[PDB]
Amino acid sequence: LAACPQNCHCHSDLQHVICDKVGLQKIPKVSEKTKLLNLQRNNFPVLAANSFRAMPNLVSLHLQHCQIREVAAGAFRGLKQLIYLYLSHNDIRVLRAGAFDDLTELTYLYLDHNKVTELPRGLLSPLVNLFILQLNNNKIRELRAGAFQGAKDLRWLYLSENALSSLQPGALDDVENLAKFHVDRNQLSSYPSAALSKLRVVEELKLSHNPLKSIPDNAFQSFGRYLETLWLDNTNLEKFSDGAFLGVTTLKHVHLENNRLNQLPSNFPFDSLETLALTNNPWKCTCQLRGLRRWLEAKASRPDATCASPAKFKGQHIRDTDAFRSCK
Ligand SMILES: [Cl-]
Ligand code: NI
């Protein structure tokens, strides 16, 4: 009785149902053996409760570009086997708790390029298996305590190009296994110490394009034994505090380009450092920069930049200049 829907293209004996831009106004009825349902580029302004009934074997659901504005509570009830959910490129503003009920198995959730403004408590509570939460290009302004409550195994959190200006203490307490954290291109006017101080296994921290101005003491200590990649490019960075890199023991990749740095802290970790972007900084070629000098001459392929001061060595390259001869 159940066959491929009208104007749709089915594959793998009705296991894959593709309805790409076919003028749908309602969720079509599909066979119970459906495992992949692509409803991209249709029109579903409101996803009501039980919008996907009788799809117990569905593992991948694609709903991008569907002009979706609201996801009602229990919109995805029954999808106990769903692994992928794409809600990217819609007009979602309202996203309340219950919207993600029954999504016990969901591992990848894409909500990027929407109009979400907040992440209320309990919204992600059912998502105990979520690994990637892609929320880039929204309008979230603030993360508060319990914003990620229930997200037990969240590893990658994408929040690039939002309007974040505040991370409350306790905001990330629920995401202990967090490895990737992208909050570049936001409104962070200071390093969110309190929020990050609770995480221990962060490996990549992307903070580019935030007016951070400076990095405080113990900025990375909590997760200092796991931090491998750090982006601080275009953060209007004037300097690092003396204790900023306390407990950092395996940092491999750093991006500092496009800032106002003249110096580096004495405890700057060069021991595990592999790549370091440092162009477009008014570097001061004095004694305190010898550590960077010693690192650059340890492997020739490592790019460098030019000193803005002192006057004698203005414009010379860090690796070529004679500004470090009078210190040993
Ligand atoms: Cl086919
Ligand atoms: Ni096919």
Author numbering: 20 to 347
Show passages lifted from the paper:
The small leucine-rich proteoglycans (SLRPs) constitute a family of secreted proteins with important roles in extracellular matrix assembly and cell signalling. The SLRPs belong to the large superfamily of leucine-rich repeat (LRR) proteins, which includes not only secreted proteins but also a large number of cell surface receptors, such as the Toll-like receptors involved in innate immunity, the platelet von Willebrand factor receptor, glycoprotein Ib, and proteins involved in neural development. Here, we report the crystal structure of fibromodulin and a different crystal form of chondroadherin, which reveal that these SLRPs do not self-associate in the same manner as decorin or biglycan. The results demonstrate that, unlike decorin, neither fibromodulin nor chondroadherin forms a stable dimer in solution.
One of the more distant homologues of fibromodulin is chondroadherin, a class IV SLRP found in cartilage and bone. In contrast to fibromodulin, chondroadherin does not contain an N-terminal tyrosine sulphate-rich region or any N-linked glycans. We obtained crystals of human chondroadherin and determined the structure at 2.17 Å resolution. The structure is complete except for the C-terminal 13 residues. The asymmetric unit of the crystals contains two structurally similar copies of chondroadherin (r.m.s. deviation of 0.7 Å for 327 Cα atoms). Firstly, the LRRNT domain of chondroadherin more closely corresponds to the consensus structure with two anti parallel β-strands, and its second strand is part of a standard LRR motif. Secondly, the LRRs II-XI of chondroadherin are more uniform in length (24–25 residues), resulting in a slightly higher curvature of the concave face. Thirdly, the ear and LRR XII of fibromodulin are replaced by a C-terminal cap (LRRCT) in chondroadherin. The LRRCT is characterised by a 10-residue α-helix and two disulphide bonds (Cys304-Cys326 and Cys306-Cys346 in chondroadherin).
